[PDB]
Design a binder for this molecule. Structure first.
Ligand SMILES: Nc1ncnc2c1ncn2[C@@H]1O[C@H](COP(=O)(O)OP(=O)(O)OP(=O)(O)O)[C@@H](O)[C@H]1O
Ligand SMILES: [Mg+2]
Lengths: 44, 495, 466, 466
């Protein structure tokens, strides 16, 4: 029973990492867009 | 005469007004005036209309509006040749060690085109780093551009200095550029090189942090011009015309920062991370000049060792990604491993060398394959280390084998192991000969074994070094000689 | 013509021309360099009265303002024809190999052509028969369609490229073009030269059947931006003759990055993730001339680098918007001695539908995907509990999946000298029938061996008998 | 050498001078105010014809667009000498304490000076003898090096600074300079002035051996930018006199922030996250003056504040690029009555290698911090097991780790009049010998509370026998 529970937990943990990585990537791109907007605005 | 007058001085940037017939990267003069007995040179980067924005190589605090400038017809050139060996110089070739003028007869221009496609040859001759981890799992060959990427204080310049020290008689002219390093750090590096006798085949360019951004911007190019002179014409080292060279750009992160500062002060349009559009072009011009010339063009070499200081292991940053794409191999030095205790902090799981075994001696390639496989197997089971008691016999055995190998890869500072010692020790480890030795005693065992071979058994070391190039290295009697040496050492010593 | 340089800022230069005969956009103005050599700058903008902003595409370190500029009156002229075969060129069309100049008798076409019109496009999609079992089965090519490959270059990608070139050369018209966008001078140029000259097929080296355009890393961003257009200009001449052309673009992401750098240098505003604002238009000027027309077809297999493995990243997103088949080379598959280390699960293709490749091909591909997915799901169970605990009617599926992943190995006609095994060309129909006959139950008695580096199912039967 | 103000935009003043009398790039301006005193501006950019753009260094809430300006010719001149000892100065060098102004007989030196040349830099790093056991054992200083503090208030950072000043003033001449760069006026002032005037050593106050220069957050960005250079000038005078100097810079990150604000107001384009393009050079022009020449040395012990907890931020990264050691004061150690809250972990140094400190020092510093390398990770197993009633060796390693943690404390000669205990100065040899003996096991058979607050292991033995 512990083996089944840990296997389910590991699968849920791996799914959460994929979801978090998907969300982190969106936050990574939005950070770049913000910087490329302030610097371009600051240039002009 | 066609000269110009400064019309505006910013944060190290002039404008020079109407200075025609100026080449796009000349080195203007700023002739001496009242209250200034010397000349400060500047690089005319922006050739605008009715304006020439030139960054100042020297100090900007002295150049006032109205100063006259004379455009010297020469593009930036540096001295090269034998006379530079063992001397610290500016990126302009002016000595700063205070030991006399540079003796030279030839000046190789900075910013020359890469050798070309057909000019090069496949990398085959190895650059013996002297570090077991690098020299076994991440081969570096003459002509390869291997990147030493890390995170703040991790050991990148320590690895570079170990590599430079290991070339004592490997017929390799080392070069150390030190872009943006502190004057104290460059002084300590030069002191270390002098202390170990490595200051008779090393040229140390240096554009320290206090120096103007122009000097930090042109430092690596001066270094690689000095290295290209070695690669093409060569210098007399130990009575042998050596045409190999090894160049270490101590920070290309700081070089990129300096170029970003130059671009922003010149009002060039920024890009991602405020870096100019052509920072990739900058680093590519710099690194691509490192080549393995074929026999038709001389057979020289120039091995480049760029170093990058990442932040929080952010590999996806702009400059790290650019240089990783440019370079042929990466040596990641992780701060986690450095703080854990593994002093050479190589992260084998992600560090790669695209040249591969072609940049390794046949003995080294024959021995290191099992080491790499066993280390990979240990890494795949790193989560079970604390659960060693409740594991299968084979899984356990894999675990202590990985622990022994990882402890073996640990190395002190300024202790480069010649190739014969590395191959002997890794043959001892790959064969089930260090299993009885406890994990914390592996380093002591290795040091004692090298001492034993150096004193008791010079013949086996000479035998291994003599036939390191044999395609079937283990076949020769060298195998039995080495086995007898290991058995005798393990009998005499106890752990 | 005969303008004068007005401003030199990095690789961006501005040349002043008379009020008339101002060069158009993409006009490739030429600057004499005081010798036979010259610097070619591509005009990208027209400002004010005669001033044109151009990208240097060269060293631009020895230039001075006021220097004479010669207008060519047309985009970058690229030599085309059979003379280009077996030669290596840069973006400008000048050969960078040891052989001499191309010569004036050879036709030169503008680098900036136009994609084929609407009527010239093929209404139907035709499968491209590469001959490799795994490529033709799980991720089928499309004639005149783009294809992406993902790999770390240590997984035998170059061997796959060489096999594709040899297959098209020996079983079709067979002319290939290799676009080295941002290709390293050492790792990606001399190595590929030696592999292509050493690799031979029917007494003809792979190098002699292809033309390679290298926009090297050390060249300015303009060269890396336009090297792909140079490669298309070279390939379109052969496409106009009715031949079928494979265009290989190495790391199209480097083309995207070169475009971004050029846009930043020109002063344009940065799009999402500091990309050029004209990302879609730049990716559409390219990869739209790669189509299957009435006269001929150009089918491209382009390497793609995913920034930080970020696929949503607008660069790989715009690349994917123009893709038909994805091939994912895997390091783990290559660790075992399977040269065609294609990951069947990660590799997909648009053309793999019943309406084109037939019902049987779709059915067998879907069944292979299902059994391999079951094997992937049961990897952890096998690793943890072992083979014994896994139940019946699933151990058979696991064994079949292992045998079928060993079956994707295929001898290569370009690697027969290295491996000592003759290459085998497997037709798509033969592949489909062989895999159907492997799935239905035949060959179950045969062990995992005898499937390794083999061709059709009859071949493995013969090997088992002998 | 007299001009007129043209524009006043915040703290940036644009002044027009005669064509042949333009001030230099870093000269002062000294706008005369109506009520007797002057507003000292600093030029930053020569531009146009006779026009200079200068930073205010003051309020500029009372200036018109016609006020005359009196160029000084030299950069900001600051009083240096023994007269400027035990006094508090602002960025301009005018004493802000209650005492009288500095007499004209005192030499005034320019604030901007070049760092020592490479020829004068020491070729071998030398350990700096502070006397604190934990400081001189785990994270040794560097002669002419830099050190950072990561700790808030209530952890005794001020007491550590006072002890360092007292030790350098007693063992060597040790003249100290304190630079308040953008620090809170309540913490930086009247909780440093009073805690150092009250603190005494050999009937001489710590404040009498220390020079204080204070540019607080209320001051304009130029003042916080140049306060560091003022402090460096004062320390460099004594360094040129041959006396070793300990220079404290409080919140060097505020110096970076002041530079960023100055650049933003000066019209420079931002770099990275709004920071100044000249970040690395600005850090170099200040930190490179902190070095150990042959005649003298300026050791620095700075304090670094990271915005939020972001060490990726450009300001902390540029600060850390110029660091030789870090000291991390910890709240938990401070609240456990161990007054020197220097965490044994997270306190690194680049001097801690065999080739400088010595084989024995490195060996002893590696044996310690190894039993603590886990941070006594055994605490969790005790927490959830009741120590399991038996832990074998772990009991011995826990006892040794607790003994070492207690032993890291050292009496403060500046806190002698507060806690009623004489301060003990422990040389590095005594530290290494004491810790070597403790790790060998001479510290055993002695209970806790006997290693709590003592100088040497010999002192602990004397306490035990008594
Ligand atoms: N191989 C090694 N053996 C022993 N100590 C080492 C080794 N590598 C690094 N160290 C230790 O780490 C310290 C810092 O190393 P190093 O100067 O190479 O770092 P870095 O990454 O170049 O840092 P920086 O960003 O400050 O230049 C050294 O002073 C030394 O104490
Ligand atoms: Mg370093």
């Amino acid at each position: 029973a512990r083996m089944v529970a840990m296997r389910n937990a590991t699968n849920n943990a791996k799914d959460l990492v994929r979801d978090l990585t998907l969300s982190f990537n969106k936050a990574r791109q939005a950070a770049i867009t913000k910087e490329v907007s302030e610097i371009a605005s600051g240039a002009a | 005469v066609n000269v110009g007058t400064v019309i505006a001085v910013g944060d190290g940037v002039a404008r020079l007004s109407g200075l025609d017939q100026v080449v796009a990267s000349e080195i203007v003069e700023f002739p001496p005036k009242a209250g200034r007995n010397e000349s400060i040179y500047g690089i005319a980067l922006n050739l605008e209309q009715d304006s020439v924005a030139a960054i100042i190589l020297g100090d900007d605090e002295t150049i006032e509006e109205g100063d006259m400038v004379t455009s010297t017809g020469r593009v930036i050139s540096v001295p090269v040749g034998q006379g530079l060996l063992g001397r610290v110089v500016n990126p302009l070739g002016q000595p700063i060690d205070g030991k006399g003028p540079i003796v030279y007869e030839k000046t190789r221009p900075i910013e020359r085109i890469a050798p070309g496609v057909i000019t090069r040859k496949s990398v085959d001759t190895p650059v013996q780093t002297g570090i077991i981890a690098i020299d076994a799992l991440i081969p570096i060959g003459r002509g390869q551009r291997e990147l030493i990427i890390g995170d703040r204080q991790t050991g990148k310049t320590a690895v570079a200095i170990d590599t430079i020290l290991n070339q004592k008689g490997q017929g390799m002219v080392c070069i150390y550029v030190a872009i943006g390093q502190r004057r104290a750090q460059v002084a300590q590096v030069v002191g270390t090189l002098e202390r170990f006798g490595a200051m008779e085949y090393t040229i140390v360019v240096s554009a320290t942090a206090s120096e103007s951004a122009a000097l930090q911007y042109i430092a690596p190019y001066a270094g690689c011009a000095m290295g290209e002179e070695i690669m093409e014409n060569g210098v007399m080292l130990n009575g042998q015309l050596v045409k190999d060279a090894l160049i270490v750009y101590d920070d290309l992160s700081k070089h990129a920062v300096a170029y970003r500062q130059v671009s922003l002060l010149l009002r060039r349009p920024p890009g991602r991370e405020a870096y100019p559009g052509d920072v990739f072009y900058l680093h590519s011009r710099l690194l691509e000049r490192a080549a393995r010339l074929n026999e038709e063009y001389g057979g020289g070499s120039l091995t480049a060792l760029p170093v990058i200081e990442t932040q929080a292991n952010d590999v996806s940053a702009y400059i790290p990604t650019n240089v990783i794409s440019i370079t042929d191999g990466q040596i990641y030095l992780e701060s986690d491993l450095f703080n854990a205790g593994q002093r050479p902090a190589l992260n084998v799981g992600i560090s790669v060398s695209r040249v591969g075994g072609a940049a390794q001696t046949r003995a080294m390639r024959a021995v290191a394959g099992k080491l790499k496989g066993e280390l990979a197997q240990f890494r795949d089971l790193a989560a079970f280390a604390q659960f060693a008691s409740d594991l299968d016999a084979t899984t356990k055995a894999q675990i202590e084998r990985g622990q022994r190998l990882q402890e073996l890869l640990k190395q002190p500072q300024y202790q480069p192991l010649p190739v014969e010692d590395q191959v002997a020790v890794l043959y001892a480890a790959t064969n089930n000969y260090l299993d009885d030795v406890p994990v914390p005693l592996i380093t002591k065992w290795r040091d004692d074994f090298l001492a034993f071979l150096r004193t008791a058994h010079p013949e086996v070391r000479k035998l291994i070094y003599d036939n390191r190039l044999d395609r079937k290295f283990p076949t020769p009697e060298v195998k039995e000689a080495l086995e007898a040496a290991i058995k005798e050492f393990k009998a005499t010593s106890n752990y | 013509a005969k303008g004068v340089i007005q401003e030199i800022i990095g690789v961006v230069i501005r040349a002043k021309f008379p009020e008339d005969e101002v060069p158009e956009i993409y006009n490739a103005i030429e600057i004499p360099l005081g010798n036979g050599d010259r610097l070619v700058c591509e005009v990208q903008q027209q400002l004010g009265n005669g001033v044109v902003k151009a990208v240097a595409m060269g060293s631009t370190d020895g230039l001075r303002r006021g220097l004479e500029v010669i207008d060519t009156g047309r985009p970058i002229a690229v030599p085309v024809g059979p003379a280009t075969l077996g030669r290596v060129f840069n973006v400008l069309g000048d050969p960078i190999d040891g052989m001499g100049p191309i010569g004036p008798e050879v036709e030169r076409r503008p680098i900036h052509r136009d994609p084929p019109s609407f009527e010239e496009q093929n209404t139907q999609a035709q499968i491209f028969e590469t001959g490799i079992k795994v490529i033709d089965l799980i991720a089928p090519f499309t004639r005149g369609g783009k294809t992406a490959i993902f790999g770390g270059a240590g997984v035998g990608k170059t061997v796959v490229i060489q096999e594709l070139i040899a297959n098209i050369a020996k079983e079709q018209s067979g002319f290939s073009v290799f676009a080295g966008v941002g290709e390293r001078s050492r790792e990606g140029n001399d190595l590929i030269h030696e592999m292509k000259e050493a690799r031979i097929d029917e007494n003809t080296t792979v190098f002699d059947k292809t033309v390679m355009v290298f926009g090297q890393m050390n060249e300015p961003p303009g060269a890396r931006l336009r090297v792909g257009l140079t490669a298309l200009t070279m390939a379109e001449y052969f496409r106009d003759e009715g031949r079928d052309i494979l265009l290989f673009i190495d790391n199209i992401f480097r083309f995207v990055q070169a475009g971004s750098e050029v846009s930043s240098l020109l002063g344009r505003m940065p799009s999402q993730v500091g990309y050029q604002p004209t990302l879609g238009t730049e990716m559409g000027e390219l990869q739209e001339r790669i189509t299957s027309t009435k006269r001929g077809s150009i089918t491209s297999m382009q390497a793609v680098y995913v920034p930080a493995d970020d696929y949503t990243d607008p660069a790989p997103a715009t690349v994917f918007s123009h893709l038909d088949a994805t091939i994912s080379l895997e390091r783990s598959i290559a660790e075992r001695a399977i040269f065609p280390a294609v990951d069947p699960l990660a590799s997909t293709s648009r053309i793999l539908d019943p309406n084109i490749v037939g019902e049987e091909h779709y059915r067998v591909a879907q069944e292979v995907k299902r059994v391999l997915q079951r094997y992937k799901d049961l990897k952890d169970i096998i690793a943890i509990l072992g083979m014994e605990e896994l139940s019946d009617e699933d151990k058979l599926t696991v064994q079949r999946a292992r045998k079928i992943e060993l079956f994707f190995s295929q001898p290569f006609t370009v690697a027969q000298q290295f491996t000592g095994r003759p290459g085998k060309y497997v037709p798509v129909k033969k592949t489909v029938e062989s895999f159907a006959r492997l799935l239905n139950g035949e060959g179950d008695h045969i062990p995992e061996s005898f499937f390794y580096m083999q061709g059709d199912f009859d071949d493995v039967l013969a090997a088992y008998e002998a």
